[PDB]
Design an enzyme around this catalytic site. Structure first.
Site, short mmCIF file in Angstrom:
data_model
loop_
_atom_site.label_atom_id
_atom_site.label_comp_id
_atom_site.label_asym_id
_atom_site.label_seq_id
_atom_site.Cartn_x
_atom_site.Cartn_y
_atom_site.Cartn_z
N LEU B 248 85.13 60.02 51.66
CA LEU B 248 85.28 59.86 50.22
C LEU B 248 86.48 58.99 49.86
O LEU B 248 86.46 58.29 48.85
CB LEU B 248 85.35 61.23 49.51
CG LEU B 248 85.77 61.21 48.03
CD1 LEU B 248 84.76 60.46 47.19
CD2 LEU B 248 85.92 62.66 47.48
N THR B 251 86.03 55.31 48.61
CA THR B 251 85.62 54.91 47.27
C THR B 251 86.30 55.73 46.19
O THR B 251 85.85 55.72 45.04
CB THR B 251 84.09 55.02 47.10
OG1 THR B 251 83.66 56.36 47.34
CG2 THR B 251 83.39 54.11 48.11
N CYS B 252 87.36 56.47 46.52
CA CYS B 252 87.97 57.35 45.52
C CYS B 252 89.44 57.48 45.92
O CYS B 252 89.79 58.18 46.89
CB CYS B 252 87.25 58.70 45.50
SG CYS B 252 87.91 59.93 44.33
N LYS B 253 90.28 56.78 45.17
CA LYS B 253 91.64 56.52 45.59
C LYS B 253 92.66 57.46 44.96
O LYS B 253 93.80 57.49 45.43
CB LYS B 253 92.01 55.06 45.31
CG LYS B 253 91.09 54.08 46.02
CD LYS B 253 91.27 54.22 47.54
CE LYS B 253 90.61 53.09 48.35
NZ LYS B 253 89.15 53.17 48.32
#
Ligand SMILES: [Mg+2]
Ligand SMILES: [Mg+2]
Ligand SMILES: [Mg+2]
Ligand SMILES: [Mg+2]
EC number: 4.1.1.46
Lengths: 339, 339, 339, 339
Positions: B248, B251-253
């Protein structure tokens, strides 16, 4: 800190399903090798964790998706029986530390009722734990829900034995997975999809009158109630002030708060939040909240160090930690049960 | 009590859609005749309510399911343009009392961006309000979500204009309705299905990196955040401690708490609960919470007598009642805006 | 975790008062020798703690009971001047880590105003911190309160310099101690007596009109407001619905909630409770709450591990941890002030 | 909405003390003529209020300061006997609606114990209600506290009869009034002084070992616990981590949280705040919270419309409204006791 705690959303898997176990771990574990050992172990690692963290008694249940993933009803029933016989044998090694929930195939109401009865009468199981709907149909794309009259014989069996039913989540599959989840797959499981399924099913039981026909039925949801306490005000308003003037009252005779006072329980599994616990004590009441862990997807350390160190009045720590479950499950004494 | 409040989940319908209006009212209203008059009225009944209950300014939007129910992209685009032209004329009558959100066909990112741009640049609309996914496909059984790179041109238009996007719910339709909701139909709408759709879409935006590519983007959810604040702890744990070790993080910072501090807003529409409001102040922060009503599905009296009389510190009553929205929407003065 | 936190109820003592320090420590420390070193150290141990625990800036103040214990006005004034000169030199070692509050003799309003002015103008002190009433009278058995017109000249100086006043507790002494506390001596200090003094004095300022004559005046209470937020409802009710109909309105023009929105601040010193913090955010508002420690009566570790790990939305963690104080005290950059 | 509620901080005064009644009303009532009629009435107005607002049963007690204002022990004892005989006769008119607490002179432990025993054995009174310390000494400037070994015979009488003791506030008098309150007199009573007295006395009982010598003793505080729940964390910390390492453990064997789970109760009298109730449910637990009004200082309408309409789970509404008191006072049957 508190000894003799009870946890009851605690999963095991059969040793022969290592491949499925490794698949599920690839979604939900950061240490697959430890997960395989912990989810298959009953009597050594689980006891060591429980001894370190003040857990006296654990009610064990089969891992998700478990039998609800099996859409061949003959295969599903044989697996449930195999699982129930297996865990009954396992907990005999240390009967003062473990109970078990029944694992069921839910393809057929009478068949499930008979196997639950066998588990309770023969083995002293404490209730049933089922992973949401039963996959069904030719390729398993159908869903069997239990919030209708076909399941009355099953729910009346729960109330005759006076044992609860734990509605555990399972993953989205088939058409539902493709349309809603495949393009946002990191939300599958604890982040969102698990709660969407369980809340749908239990509020389906509410609005289709299951607790009116079987008002003694006790239903347990993990994860502090799968979002439902957050919308207690909103659901109550849209039931009592809206849908119950439009037809819902024909199949739903009490308020959502009534059903949470009389029928529904929530668990602290995988939701180790004192702020959310306090809010649930307001919306649901500490009498209706049970400690649990969600092992081995969560650690004993995370769950127990949270609960043991949480700011909580002594009355509710005792109730949520063990005394609520002691009464609900009519538990005999167990290790540290009155420490 | 408090004057100059701002509400911004306030719906209208076109007079020519009375049949559709009565259908929606048959599901969600207990006084259909008043509902029909109120949802089409802008400048008489709606003003009388606001004058009685201390609402200075309302940002109006098209009723659900609105344009998202229209799976012919040519018909949908023409209807959105018609709605935006219509409401611009209506709000010109009382510009110190009303603004509007853009109504959009979301079949095509560039087309939606151009109509949003027209609304903001030509009419001074304050943002967009969209009823979840766009129905698409031959019979409207497909769903268009906006949490992917194809929508970058649209989200960049939102941030270039610096206006928010309100993700409003819509009803379940087609196969999803048949499989999940038809057998428990009283849960459709506010009781459950609405929040399931919106939370899925917004957490899809989170986990598919929309707020990383568009860090200035502001997204608003009604109904105190569609369950998401309840699971803030649980989502955060299963992102940061689980899924972000499995992929994850690609794409998810940021954390879910980061996105609520920087990108996401919640509204009090249809959730008039001080106990739940207090919990949302803990989990989201009063700076990110906006008063709203959900008129005419909710009454001004229910929303305003709750909010005006709720036990609340004076600082947060002012922020939530109007000052948060005044800043977010860059509002010039309006009736009672500094009362 | 959070860096750049500000703490501002942080005490020091003069090295030459070792005997008094050890006496006070015998009541309030379980490790008096470390306490003596820590309360006398400015620039070494405090920095080591602050570096370990994410504290960027500390505003220092003189230990309780401090100058308020000195009932000889000549001795008291000389000690205040001595303390202020001393700490100005000490904070000079690390201005990027330390500020100071003025220490005052409060025997005489004009004298106290002049020394506060000297501290702010000569040394850049950030305000005043005073330990409740000033002992006065033949054996120091009298008490000087500041909630009357004789102190208008002092409060007008606070607003002219635009700096806050921290009302810190002190121990009960003399006749009051003998009558109320000697027979239940373990309640002296943080368990009860401290809050009784401060709440009496600050609510005296409220009901005697200090904030009406000086609407810009900012008053800070530690320990999450010394019980006052608990009775916000009860005080407001007994003001607005009772005493303000009997004469209180002649000297008290706003509600208790108005004064908490406009004049009064609370601090988290010595009260590391997320449950109580959440309640104070409801009753007082996160905009009016400041992080603080109460070092060396409390440890950096207790305060900072609580605050850094508390379940809190990111907006309010930032505000309470540092941004509220940055604005209130008009702070230039300091270590990690924007980390 | 809820019928059969129990309230137990509900005061009456003797008709012959009208002058004293009017003085007390001049401090604490905005309608003295109604207050005089209501505080003296037992069987008409009080029943009419209870019938309108769902109060099935009331335990009556003597107004404050009552006998604790009388520093002549012969006069005080004669007044206590007079009051108890009087109210026993009055409540026989409506035994399904009224009980009584004993009114006591607390000048002498054995004398108070004998009169409490007479009230319970002869009249079936439900416990004792005492207005904080007993005024004593030549002009009444001394204070008798009950947190010492001389009172063991009295507390042992409470536990042998198994009846609770309600520690009600009284006004500050004499030197304490002159030194602390005269210059901020609007704070006398509910705004602040009442809670300062009761919390001091009950925490004196805690720290002087009363509940260790009398572990069955039940002590009740009104007004949601007179600030104590706000500082539950802070008191517990300064006991267990500080004073209990310095000698307090020698006379105080359990934690403050233990004593709230086993010995101490709080009431909702005069504190009709759902936000504060929720916080008290977290800090004290709903099992230990009792509904009450504080009539006629508060109205039935304020107390009952607040409680009947507060957002609360059904379990705790039932417990706090009546079931906690039914069990504590062994109230098997009264009007609407099972509605
Ligand atoms: Mg689980
Ligand atoms: Mg809406
Ligand atoms: Mg301090
Ligand atoms: Mg009273």
């Amino acid at each position: 800190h508190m000894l003799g705690k009870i946890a009851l959303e605690e999963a095991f898997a059969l040793p022969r399903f290592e491949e499925k176990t490794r698949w599920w771990a690839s979604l939900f574990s950061t240490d697959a090798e430890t997960h395989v050992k912990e989810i298959t172990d009953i009597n050594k690692i689980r006891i060591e964790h429980a001894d370190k963290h003040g857990v006296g008694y654990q009610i064990l249940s089969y891992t998700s998706p478990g039998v609800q993933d099996i859409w061949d009803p003959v295969e599903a029933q044989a697996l449930a029986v195999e699982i129930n016989d297996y865990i009954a044998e396992q907990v005999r090694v240390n009967p003062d530390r473990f109970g078990a929930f029944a694992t069921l195939s839910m393809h057929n109401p009478k068949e499930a009722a008979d196997e639950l009865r066998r588990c309770v009468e023969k083995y002293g199981f404490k209730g049933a734990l089922v992973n949401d709907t039963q996959r069904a149909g030719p390729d398993g794309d159908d869903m069997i829900f239990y919030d209708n009259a076909d399941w009355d014989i099953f729910w009346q069996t729960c109330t005759e034995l006076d044992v609860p039913f734990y509605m555990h989540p399972r993953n989205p599959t088939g058409t539902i997975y493709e349309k809603l989840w495949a393009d946002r797959k990191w939300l599958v499981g604890p982040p969102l999809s698990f709660a969407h399924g369980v809340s749908l099913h239990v509020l389906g039981m509410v609005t289709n009158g299951v607790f009116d026909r079987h008002p003694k039925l006790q239903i347990i949801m993990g994860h502090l109630g799968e979002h439902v306490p957050f919308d207690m005000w909103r659901i109550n308003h849209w039931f009592e002030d809206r849908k119950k003037l439009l037809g819902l009252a024909e199949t739903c005779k009490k308020t959502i708060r009534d059903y949470f006072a009389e029928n529904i329980w929530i668990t602290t599994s995988g939701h180790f939040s004192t702020t959310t616990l306090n809010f649930c004590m307001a919306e649901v009441g500490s009498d209706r909240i049970l400690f649990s862990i969600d092992y081995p997807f969560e650690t004993f350390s995370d769950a127990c160090e949270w609960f043991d160190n949480a700011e909580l009045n002594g009355t509710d720590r005792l109730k949520i930690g063990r005394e609520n479950a002691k009464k609900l499950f009519k538990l005999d004494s167990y290790k540290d049960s009155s420490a």
